[PDB]
Design a protein around this ligand. Sequence first.
Ligand SMILES: *[C@@H]1O[C@H](CO)[C@@H](O[C@@H]2O[C@H](CO)[C@@H](O[C@@H]3O[C@H](CO[C@H]4O[C@H](CO)[C@@H](O)[C@H](O)[C@@H]4O)[C@@H](O)[C@H](O[C@H]4O[C@H](CO)[C@@H](O)[C@H](O)[C@@H]4O[C@H]4O[C@H](CO)[C@@H](O)[C@H](O)[C@@H]4O[C@H]4O[C@H](CO)[C@@H](O)[C@H](O)[C@@H]4O)[C@@H]3O)[C@H](O)[C@H]2NC(C)=O)[C@H](O)[C@H]1NC(C)=O
Ligand SMILES: *[C@@H]1O[C@H](CO)[C@@H](O[C@@H]2O[C@H](CO)[C@@H](O[C@@H]3O[C@H](CO[C@H]4O[C@H](CO)[C@@H](O)[C@H](O)[C@@H]4O)[C@@H](O)[C@H](O[C@H]4O[C@H](CO)[C@@H](O)[C@H](O)[C@@H]4O[C@H]4O[C@H](CO)[C@@H](O)[C@H](O)[C@@H]4O[C@H]4O[C@H](CO)[C@@H](O)[C@H](O)[C@@H]4O)[C@@H]3O)[C@H](O)[C@H]2NC(C)=O)[C@H](O)[C@H]1NC(C)=O
Ligand SMILES: *[C@@H]1O[C@H](CO)[C@@H](O[C@@H]2O[C@H](CO)[C@@H](O[C@@H]3O[C@H](CO[C@H]4O[C@H](CO)[C@@H](O)[C@H](O)[C@@H]4O)[C@@H](O)[C@H](O[C@H]4O[C@H](CO)[C@@H](O)[C@H](O)[C@@H]4O[C@H]4O[C@H](CO)[C@@H](O)[C@H](O)[C@@H]4O[C@H]4O[C@H](CO)[C@@H](O)[C@H](O)[C@@H]4O)[C@@H]3O)[C@H](O)[C@H]2NC(C)=O)[C@H](O)[C@H]1NC(C)=O
Ligand SMILES: *[C@@H]1O[C@H](CO)[C@@H](O[C@@H]2O[C@H](CO)[C@@H](O[C@@H]3O[C@H](CO[C@H]4O[C@H](CO)[C@@H](O)[C@H](O)[C@@H]4O)[C@@H](O)[C@H](O[C@H]4O[C@H](CO)[C@@H](O)[C@H](O)[C@@H]4O[C@H]4O[C@H](CO)[C@@H](O)[C@H](O)[C@@H]4O[C@H]4O[C@H](CO)[C@@H](O)[C@H](O)[C@@H]4O)[C@@H]3O)[C@H](O)[C@H]2NC(C)=O)[C@H](O)[C@H]1NC(C)=O
Ligand SMILES: *[C@@H]1O[C@H](CO)[C@@H](O)[C@H](O)[C@H]1NC(C)=O
Ligand SMILES: *[C@@H]1O[C@H](CO)[C@@H](O)[C@H](O)[C@H]1NC(C)=O
Ligand SMILES: *[C@@H]1O[C@H](CO)[C@@H](O)[C@H](O)[C@H]1NC(C)=O
Ligand SMILES: *[C@@H]1O[C@H](CO)[C@@H](O)[C@H](O)[C@H]1NC(C)=O
Ligand SMILES: *[C@@H]1O[C@H](CO)[C@@H](O)[C@H](O)[C@H]1NC(C)=O
Ligand SMILES: *[C@@H]1O[C@H](CO)[C@@H](O)[C@H](O)[C@H]1NC(C)=O
Ligand SMILES: *[C@@H]1O[C@H](CO)[C@@H](O)[C@H](O)[C@H]1NC(C)=O
Ligand SMILES: *[C@@H]1O[C@H](CO)[C@@H](O)[C@H](O)[C@H]1NC(C)=O
Ligand SMILES: [Ca+2]
Ligand SMILES: [Ca+2]
Ligand SMILES: [Ca+2]
Ligand SMILES: [Ca+2]
Lengths: 388, 388, 388, 388
Amino acid sequence: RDFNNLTKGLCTINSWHIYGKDNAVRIGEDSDVLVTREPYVSCDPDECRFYALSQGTTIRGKHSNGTIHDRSQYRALISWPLSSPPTVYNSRVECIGWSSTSCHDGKTRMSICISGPNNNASAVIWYNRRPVTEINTWARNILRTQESECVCHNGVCPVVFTDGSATGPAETRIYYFKEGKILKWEPLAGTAKHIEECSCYGERAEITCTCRDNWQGSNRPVIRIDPVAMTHTSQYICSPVLTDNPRPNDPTVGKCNDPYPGNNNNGVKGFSYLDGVNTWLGRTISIASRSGYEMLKVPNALTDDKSKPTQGQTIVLNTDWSGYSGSFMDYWAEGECYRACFYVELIRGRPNEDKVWWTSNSIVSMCSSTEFLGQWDWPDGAKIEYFL
Amino acid sequence: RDFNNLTKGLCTINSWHIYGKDNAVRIGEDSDVLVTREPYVSCDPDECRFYALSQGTTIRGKHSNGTIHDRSQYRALISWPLSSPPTVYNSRVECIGWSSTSCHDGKTRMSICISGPNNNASAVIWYNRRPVTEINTWARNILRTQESECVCHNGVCPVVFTDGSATGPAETRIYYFKEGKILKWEPLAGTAKHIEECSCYGERAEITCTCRDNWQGSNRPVIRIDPVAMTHTSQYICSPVLTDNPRPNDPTVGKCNDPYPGNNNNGVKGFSYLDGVNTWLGRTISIASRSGYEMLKVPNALTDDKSKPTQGQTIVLNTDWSGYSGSFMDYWAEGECYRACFYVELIRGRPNEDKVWWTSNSIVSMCSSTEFLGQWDWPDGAKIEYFL
Amino acid sequence: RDFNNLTKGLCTINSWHIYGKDNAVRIGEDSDVLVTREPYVSCDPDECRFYALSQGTTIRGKHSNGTIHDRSQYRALISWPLSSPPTVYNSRVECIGWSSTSCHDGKTRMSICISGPNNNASAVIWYNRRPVTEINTWARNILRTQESECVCHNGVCPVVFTDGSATGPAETRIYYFKEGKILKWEPLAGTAKHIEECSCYGERAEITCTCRDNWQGSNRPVIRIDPVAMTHTSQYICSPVLTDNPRPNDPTVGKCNDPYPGNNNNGVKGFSYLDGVNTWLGRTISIASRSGYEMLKVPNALTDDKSKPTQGQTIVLNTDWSGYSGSFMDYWAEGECYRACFYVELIRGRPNEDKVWWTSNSIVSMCSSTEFLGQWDWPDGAKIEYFL
Amino acid sequence: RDFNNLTKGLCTINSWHIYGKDNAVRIGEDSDVLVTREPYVSCDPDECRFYALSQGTTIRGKHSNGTIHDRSQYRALISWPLSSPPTVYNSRVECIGWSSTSCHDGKTRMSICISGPNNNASAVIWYNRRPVTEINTWARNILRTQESECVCHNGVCPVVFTDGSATGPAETRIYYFKEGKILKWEPLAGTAKHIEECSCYGERAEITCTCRDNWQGSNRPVIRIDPVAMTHTSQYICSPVLTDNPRPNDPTVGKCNDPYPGNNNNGVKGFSYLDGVNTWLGRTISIASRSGYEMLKVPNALTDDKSKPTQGQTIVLNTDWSGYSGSFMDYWAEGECYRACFYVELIRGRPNEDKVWWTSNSIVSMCSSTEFLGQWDWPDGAKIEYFL
Ligand SMILES: *[C@@H]1O[C@H](CO)[C@@H](O[C@@H]2O[C@H](CO)[C@@H](O[C@@H]3O[C@H](CO[C@H]4O[C@H](CO)[C@@H](O)[C@H](O)[C@@H]4O)[C@@H](O)[C@H](O[C@H]4O[C@H](CO)[C@@H](O)[C@H](O)[C@@H]4O[C@H]4O[C@H](CO)[C@@H](O)[C@H](O)[C@@H]4O[C@H]4O[C@H](CO)[C@@H](O)[C@H](O)[C@@H]4O)[C@@H]3O)[C@H](O)[C@H]2NC(C)=O)[C@H](O)[C@H]1NC(C)=O
Ligand SMILES: *[C@@H]1O[C@H](CO)[C@@H](O[C@@H]2O[C@H](CO)[C@@H](O[C@@H]3O[C@H](CO[C@H]4O[C@H](CO)[C@@H](O)[C@H](O)[C@@H]4O)[C@@H](O)[C@H](O[C@H]4O[C@H](CO)[C@@H](O)[C@H](O)[C@@H]4O[C@H]4O[C@H](CO)[C@@H](O)[C@H](O)[C@@H]4O[C@H]4O[C@H](CO)[C@@H](O)[C@H](O)[C@@H]4O)[C@@H]3O)[C@H](O)[C@H]2NC(C)=O)[C@H](O)[C@H]1NC(C)=O
Ligand SMILES: *[C@@H]1O[C@H](CO)[C@@H](O[C@@H]2O[C@H](CO)[C@@H](O[C@@H]3O[C@H](CO[C@H]4O[C@H](CO)[C@@H](O)[C@H](O)[C@@H]4O)[C@@H](O)[C@H](O[C@H]4O[C@H](CO)[C@@H](O)[C@H](O)[C@@H]4O[C@H]4O[C@H](CO)[C@@H](O)[C@H](O)[C@@H]4O[C@H]4O[C@H](CO)[C@@H](O)[C@H](O)[C@@H]4O)[C@@H]3O)[C@H](O)[C@H]2NC(C)=O)[C@H](O)[C@H]1NC(C)=O
Ligand SMILES: *[C@@H]1O[C@H](CO)[C@@H](O[C@@H]2O[C@H](CO)[C@@H](O[C@@H]3O[C@H](CO[C@H]4O[C@H](CO)[C@@H](O)[C@H](O)[C@@H]4O)[C@@H](O)[C@H](O[C@H]4O[C@H](CO)[C@@H](O)[C@H](O)[C@@H]4O[C@H]4O[C@H](CO)[C@@H](O)[C@H](O)[C@@H]4O[C@H]4O[C@H](CO)[C@@H](O)[C@H](O)[C@@H]4O)[C@@H]3O)[C@H](O)[C@H]2NC(C)=O)[C@H](O)[C@H]1NC(C)=O
Ligand SMILES: *[C@@H]1O[C@H](CO)[C@@H](O)[C@H](O)[C@H]1NC(C)=O
Ligand SMILES: *[C@@H]1O[C@H](CO)[C@@H](O)[C@H](O)[C@H]1NC(C)=O
Ligand SMILES: *[C@@H]1O[C@H](CO)[C@@H](O)[C@H](O)[C@H]1NC(C)=O
Ligand SMILES: *[C@@H]1O[C@H](CO)[C@@H](O)[C@H](O)[C@H]1NC(C)=O
Ligand SMILES: *[C@@H]1O[C@H](CO)[C@@H](O)[C@H](O)[C@H]1NC(C)=O
Ligand SMILES: *[C@@H]1O[C@H](CO)[C@@H](O)[C@H](O)[C@H]1NC(C)=O
Ligand SMILES: *[C@@H]1O[C@H](CO)[C@@H](O)[C@H](O)[C@H]1NC(C)=O
Ligand SMILES: *[C@@H]1O[C@H](CO)[C@@H](O)[C@H](O)[C@H]1NC(C)=O
Ligand SMILES: [Ca+2]
Ligand SMILES: [Ca+2]
Ligand SMILES: [Ca+2]
Ligand SMILES: [Ca+2]
C-alpha cells in the first residue's frame, strides 16, 4: 500500500530447497489443462503465483497439434495458483500476446504483453487490471521482452526490450515505468553485443539482469540498473563456466567484455545470482541440448576471469529435458535478507519427442536455504507414450 | 458508492489495440464450454466482464444440435471473467431470458431479461441481484431490447425496447430507470423509421446509441438521449459509408433523415463513436455476408452527407466470419478522457458452416490508443473439421 | 447482523415471473453434474442459493445406476450458486444425510441433516458451519423432516419432524431452536391426522406451513405457528380444489377438519400462500401422476369450504414431469412487502422414464408480480434418448 | 488473531456422529479427482478442511498405474473444502513432499513437508504460506513425521519426527516451533521403544499423542507433552484391548512399559482419547487385515492393565476396508468443552483389490455427542468393477 523499496541484501545461499512443482503434463493427460510455454513465477504482497504464455488449447484437444510455433493470435499471459496445473477453469488472463513480463510495485501489478505480425507489432502496458500505455515497434522485427518478472524500487519499474535481428545487431532499450506511464528510456550501453530475454532481481537499491546474447557468446550478458538515477551498464560474466546452450566445452580463462566464440545464432533464457563469494550460476548439463540442469557456486564469477566451481546442486538429471529458467524473489517475506529463488521450464513434445504433435511444459521452482540440504532431482514425470 | 456521472469527453482515437479475446470454440472442442450467442462486455468499478445469452448446453454435448434458434426456455444471461471461455463451472447467471441489457450505476448493477412466447412476453428488471420491476408486452410481437450494455448518469439509466414488427412499423419506447424502478417512458420521436438493437455510450452528460433499422435502411439510426431532462431525438448517419449488412455498395451522397434503399427486411447489430473529426465507424467488409470487420475514420460522419474515410483498421479479414458488434467503455478508469472500446462476435456453425448441427461464437475486443499502432487480424481460430 | 424479524405482510400476487432455472439434466449429459433429488431454495442477507440432497455420483457415471432409492450413506445436503447446475466442482456440502431443512436467522445459518438406518436414525443441527445439537429417533421408524427451508423470527426457528408410520398414526413434533440449541418442543395438536414434508413461510410474526398427509387426505394439512409464544394449531384447507397427488377429481364442497377420502397411503410435497382474497394454491395437473403444474387463485381457500378458482397460471404443461414443490421468500429484499416465491422439482429417470437406470432432477423457480404478466411453460428440456 | 491456548477439557463422549464424508472414489470414476493417500482433517478459526498427500494424477488417468508406492517427486500436501472430493480444480497445494503435518496457531498456519531420497531427505517448515525453516536428515534413513495435525498452545507447536530404522531402534526427536522457527528439540525419552506416525490432541494445556511402534508392540505408545515447559514423557497403553494391526488376539492382562509381543515389523497409524473414565480407543476389527473399524469405551485404558470395554460403536463393518485413522478437534468452536473428533481413511486398490493398477482412498469423519445416538456403518461405497 506504499511502493516497495529494495532495502535488503541476499541471504547466503548454501543449498536450494523445493518451493513449487506443477506435475502439469502428468495431470494434463486426463484434465483440462492448457498448452503453455515460457513460464515464470511472480509474487504479490499476499500471494505468489505461477505464470505462462497460453496456446489457447487443452493438451488433449485437437488444436494442440501445431503448438511448436511461437507467435499467433491465440496466445495469452495467464496466472494460476502456486503448484496447481494451468487449467481452463482456474487461470486468470492478464493480457493478450506472445511475449510478456510482469511485476507488482507494492501498490498494484504492471503487466506487459506484445502482439502483432513480425513487422508491425506493439506492446500495451496494463496497470491495476487496465490498459494505460502502448508502445509501437521501432525496428520492425519481432518486438520482444523478458519472458520473466521485472522488479520495481519506489514506484519505478525498468523493463528491457529488444527489437530487430536475433542474428546480428538489434536495438535494445531500457524503459522506466511508474504507474504504467513512461518516465524515460535509454538505448543499450556498455560492452554487451546482443540482448534477448533478461532474467532480473534487485537488492540494496540496485537491479541485476542476466540475459542471452543470441548472436555470438556462450558466456552471458549482464545489465546492472540504478532505479533512482535511472541509468544502466552492461558487461559479460568473466568466468570460464559457460552457461548458455548450445555452448563449447568450458575453458581455463574467460572473457569479461566480449562474447566467447563457439556457437553462433542460438541460445536459451537463463539466470545467475551475482554476489561476490555468494555467487551461483545455473545451466544445462548438456553442452549440446536442453537436457538436465545444475546450479554451480562460482565465487566472484562476474569479475574473476579464471573462477571455477566450489560447490554444486543437480536439479534435473541429464536424461530429462529442461528448457528456460529465470529468477524471482518474494520481496514481502518477513526476515532480514532476500531469499534467492528460480524456476526451470520442463519442455515436453516437439522438437525432441517427435511422436506427438504438440509442445507443452511444467515448472519446478526452488529457493535458497542457509542450511546444507541433501539433493534430489525433479524431472517432469509424464510418459509420452500415454498420449499415443 | 455514489452514482457515476458522465463527466469526461472521449480521448482521440488514432488506432485500436487488443483488449480481450476468448478463443472459446477452440478451447470448447475439449472443455465444458457453454453454447452462446449475442455477447457484449460491461464493467463494474473494480472489474470488467464478458457477457452472453447461453443456450443451456456445452458445445460438445448432444443438446447443442438445434442451437441455431433464437428463443427458448433454456437460455440465460451469464457473465464470466475477462478473456476466459464461458464455462459451465465459471459463469454467473444474471437472469433467465432470450434478450437482455445490463449496466452498473456506480452503486450496483441493473440487469434486464425478457422471456415468453412471441405474443405474451415480459421483462423483469433486476437491481442488486434481486427482481424489482416487471414490464409486459405492449404490441404482442417479440418484446425485445439492446443486446449490449446500457449507460447511467447520476442514477438514471435509459433503455430502448422495440415491441412489434421487424418488417414494418414497430413501437419503440425509451424507458428511464433509477434503482430498478421506472421514472418515465417515451415513444420514439425524431426521424428514424425502425429501431432494433441499440449499441450505446455516453460522455459529457449525453448518451448516444447507434441502432439497426431492420425494415429499410443500409445507413444506421441514431438516438441521442439527455439523462437529466430525460428526452431524446433520432436521425440517420449522413455519410455514404453504409455500415449495415446486407447493404448496397457505397454511394457518393448519403441521407441524414431517411433510410437508404437497397436491402429490405434484414440487418446486423453494429455501432459507431460519433465525435466530430474524431469519428470512427465499424462495419462488415462483405456487403453480402457477415464476413470480416473493419473500422473506418470518417470525419463528421453524422452531419456531412458526403463524408469519406480518412484512415482505417482491419479487425477480421474477409475470409473469416464476424457477426454482431457493440460499444462499451470503462467509466471508472484513471485519466482525463473516456477510452472508446468495442467487441465483435465471431459466429461459428449454422447457417454458414453447415457440416455441424450447432451455432456458437467467441469474442474479440479492442479499445482506443492515441498512438498510431500497427494492426493484425483476429479470427476465431477453430477448425470446424475437428468437431466431425 | 442482528436477528431478522417477520415485520411485513405479503405483496399482492397478480401473476408469477421466472426467478431461477437450472437446465441441470440438459447440461448434465456432458458435464460433471451431481445426481440430486429433493431440492429447495433458501436466501442469506446477501445472496440466494439452490439446495439439494446429492446422491454421491455424476449423472453420467456408473454409480448413477440405482439412484431411485431414497436413503443411503452416500447422500448429502449441497448448495450451489442460483441457476447454475449442481456440479462436483461448484457445490458446498452443508451436512451428511438423507432428509434436511435450512434457514438463515439474520446472523448465520442453521442446517439440519438426518442419517441412520430406519430404526436408529439421528439429526445433528449445524449452526454457523459447526455441529451443535443432536436428536435421536423417538418412534424408531424413519425420523424425517421438511425437505425445504424453515423460517426464523427474532432468533427462534421452529422445525417440524415426523417419526413413525407413513401409513397410519405417526408422532410429529414441532421443535423451536435458537442458535442451534433446543428451547422447547411440542407434540402435534389441532385436527390434522398425519404430517409429512412441511413447506413453510412467515409474515407479520406468524408462520404458516402447508404439509402432506400421506395416510388419507387429498386436501392438505396446515400448521400455523406463533414464534414468540412458541405454540401452534393445525387444520386442513377447506376448499374443494384438492391439491395433493394422486387425488380424486375435485368436489363441490370440501372439508376443513378431516381428510378428504379418495387415495390412501401416497402423496407429494406441495405448498400454498394463504392470505384471504390473495390466496394461491399450486398443484399437479394430473390427478393420477406427477405431471404438469399450475397455480390457481382461490379466494379464502383455507376457510371457505365451497371456494373455486378465480384466476390461474400454468407452470409445467401436462406432458412434462414435475415432482416436489415448496415455498421461499427473500426476507432481506428492499420494499414494503414480502414477495412470495416457489420452486418445482422436475424429476427425470425412474420410475417414469424406465429406459435409463438413474433418477435425477432440475429446478424452476418463480416469484410474485403485482403486474398481470403473460405466461410460458418451463419444462426440464433434456431428451432421455441422448443418454442411451 | 492472538495465539490460541488450550483452555478447556474434553466433553463426555457418549457416542459419535457423522461430521464429514467424501464419497471420493465413487465420484472419482467420472470426475477429475486426484489419487491420494495419508489423509487428515485440520481446522482454522473460520473453517475446517480435508487434507492429503496427492500422487500427481487423476484416478482415471494412465499415470495412476503405480500409485501403490509411497515416495516420489510427484507427491504434494493439498487441502480442499470439507466433504468435497480432492479435485484437480478445487485443491490448494500447501508444500511439495511425501510426509507432512499441519496446524493453525490462532494467528496463521504452519505446514511441514519432507522430500528427498531415502538417505538425503529434508523438511521445510512453511509459516503463513512462506518457507521459513529447513531441517536435514539426522540418521539418513527416511526422515518422516506425523501424517496428521499437530497442536499449538500460546504459539509453541511441537512436532514429532523419526529418522532411521522402522525395524529396530530409530532416532525420534520432539521439535518445538514458534512462528515457523525452532525454539528447542529433545531426543525421545520415557519407556516407549519405537515411534512412527503420532496422532495428537490437547486440552488443559497438555498435549497427548498416541503413536505406532512399528518394531514390536501390538499395544500403542503414548507421548505426553508440556508446551509451556517444553518437556515430554512416553509409556505404552496398559489395557489388553490391543489396538494396532496386524496384532494377536486380546489378552487378560496388558503392559504399561513394554511392547506386547505378537506381530513384529508392521502396523498402522491409529489414535485414542485418554481421559480417565471417558476413554475411547479406536481399532480395526480384523486382527489380521485393515478391514472394519470400531470405537470402544475402555475406562482408564492408559493406567489400568486389566481394563475391558464398557460400550462401543461400529464405524466400518468388517467386510469393508479401512486403513489409517487420526484425531482432530475444532479448538475455535463456541461452548465449554472441546469436542473429540477423528477421521478414518478408506483405502481402495492395491494391495487388496488387485484387479486395478492404482491405490486411492476416501475419508469419513466423526465427532462426539453427549447423547446416546444410534449407529450406522460408513463404507467407501465404490464398486471396483466399474473401473475395469
Ligand atoms: C547428499 O546430499 C549432498 C548435497 O547435495 C551431496 O553433496 C553434494 O554432492 C554434489 C555431487 O558430488 C556436489 O557437487 C559437485 O561439487 C563440485 C565441487 O567440488 C570441488 O570443490 C570441493 C571443495 O573444494 C571439493 O570437495 C571437490 O573435490 C572439488 O574440489 C563440483 O565441481 C561438481 O560439478 C562439476 O561436476 C559435475 C559432475 O559431478 C558437472 O556436471 C559440473 O558441470 C561440474 O563439472 C564440469 O564443469 C567444471 C567447471 O568448468 C569442469 O571442471 C569439469 O571438468 C566439468 O566439465 C565438463 O562438463 C560440463 C557439463 O557437462 C561441460 O560444460 C564441460 O565442457 C565439460 O564437458 C558438483 O557440482 C556438492 O558440491 C555437494 N554438496 C555439499 C554441501 O557437499 C551428497 O553427495 C548427497 N549424496 C549422498 C550419497 O549422501
Ligand atoms: C503496419 O500497420 C499500419 C497500421 O495499420 C498500416 O497502416 C494502415 O494501413 C491500412 C491499409 O492500407 C490503412 O487503411 C486504409 O486507409 C484508407 C485511408 O486512405 C485515404 O486517406 C489517406 C490520407 O488522406 C491517404 O494516404 C490514402 O491515399 C487515401 O487517400 C482507407 O480508404 C482504406 O479503406 C478502404 O479500403 C479498404 C481496402 O483497403 C476497404 O475495405 C474499405 O472499406 C475502404 O474502401 C471501400 O469503401 C470506400 C468508402 O466508400 C470506397 O471509396 C472504396 O472504393 C471501397 O468501396 C468498396 O468496398 C466496400 C467494402 O468492401 C464496399 O462497401 C463498397 O461498396 C465498395 O465495394 C483503409 O482503411 C490505414 O489507414 C493505415 N494507417 C495508418 C496510421 O497509416 C500499415 O500498412 C501496416 N503494414 C505494414 C506492411 O507496415
Ligand atoms: C397471455 O397471458 C395471459 C396470462 O397468462 C393469459 O391469461 C390467462 O389465461 C389462463 C388460461 O385460460 C387463465 O387461467 C384459467 O383461469 C380460470 C379462471 O377463470 C374463471 O374466472 C374468470 C373471472 O371470473 C372468468 O374469466 C372465467 O370465465 C372463469 O369464470 C381457471 O378456472 C382456469 O383453471 C381451470 O382450468 C384449467 C384448464 O384451463 C384446469 O387445469 C384447472 O385445474 C382449472 O380447472 C379444473 O379445476 C376446476 C376447479 O375445481 C374445475 O372447475 C374444472 O372443471 C377443472 O377440473 C378438472 O381438472 C382438474 C385438473 O385437471 C382435476 O383436478 C379435476 O378433477 C377435474 O378433472 C385457468 O387457470 C388465467 O386466469 C388468465 N390470466 C389473466 C390475468 O387473464 C392469456 O390467455 C395468454 N394467452 C394469449 C393467447 O394471449
Ligand atoms: C441402535 O443403536 C444403538 C447405538 O449403537 C445400539 O446399541 C449399541 O450396540 C452395540 C453393539 O451391540 C454396543 O456395542 C458393544 O458394546 C459392548 C459393551 O457391552 C458390555 O458392557 C455392557 C454394560 O456393562 C453390557 O450391556 C454388555 O452385556 C457387556 O457387558 C462391547 O463389548 C462390544 O464390543 C465387543 O464386541 C464386538 C462385537 O460385538 C467386538 O468386535 C469388539 O472388539 C468387542 O469384543 C472383542 O474384544 C473384547 C475385548 O478384548 C473381547 O472381550 C471380545 O471377546 C472380543 O474379542 C475378539 O474380537 C476382537 C475383534 O474381532 C479381537 O481383537 C479379539 O482378539 C477377539 O478375537 C460392542 O462394542 C453398544 O455398546 C451399544 N450402545 C449403547 C449406548 O447401548 C443398538 O444395538 C442399535 N440397534 C438396534 C437394533 O436398535
Ligand atoms: C519506499 O521509499 C519511499 C521514500 O523513498 C517511502 O515513501 C515509501 O513509503 C517506502 N516504502 C515503504 C513500504 O515504506
Ligand atoms: C497435425 O497436422 C498435420 C497437417 O497440418 C497432419 O499431417 C497431422 O497428422 C496432424 N496431427 C494429427 C494427430 O492429426
Ligand atoms: C454525481 O453527481 C451527483 C450530483 O449531481 C453527486 O452527488 C454524485 O456524488 C456524483 N458522483 C460522484 C461519483 O461523485
Ligand atoms: C439433429 O436433429 C435432427 C432432427 O431433429 C437430426 O436429423 C440430426 O441428425 C441431428 N444431428 C445429429 C448430429 O444427431
Ligand atoms: C428483531 O427484534 C429484536 C427485538 O424484538 C431487535 O433487537 C432486533 O434488532 C430486531 N431485528 C432487527 C434486524 O433489527
Ligand atoms: C444396473 O444394475 C443392475 C443390477 O444391479 C443391472 O442389471 C443393470 O444392467 C445395471 N445398469 C447398467 C446400465 O449397467
Ligand atoms: C493465550 O495466552 C496468552 C497469555 O499466556 C495471551 O496473550 C493470549 O492472548 C491468549 N490467547 C487468547 C486467544 O487470548
Ligand atoms: C502398469 O504398468 C505395468 C509395467 O510398468 C504393466 O504391465 C501394466 O499392464 C500397467 N497397467 C495398465 C492398465 O496398463
Ligand atoms: Ca548464445
Ligand atoms: Ca437494414
Ligand atoms: Ca395424501
Ligand atoms: Ca506394531
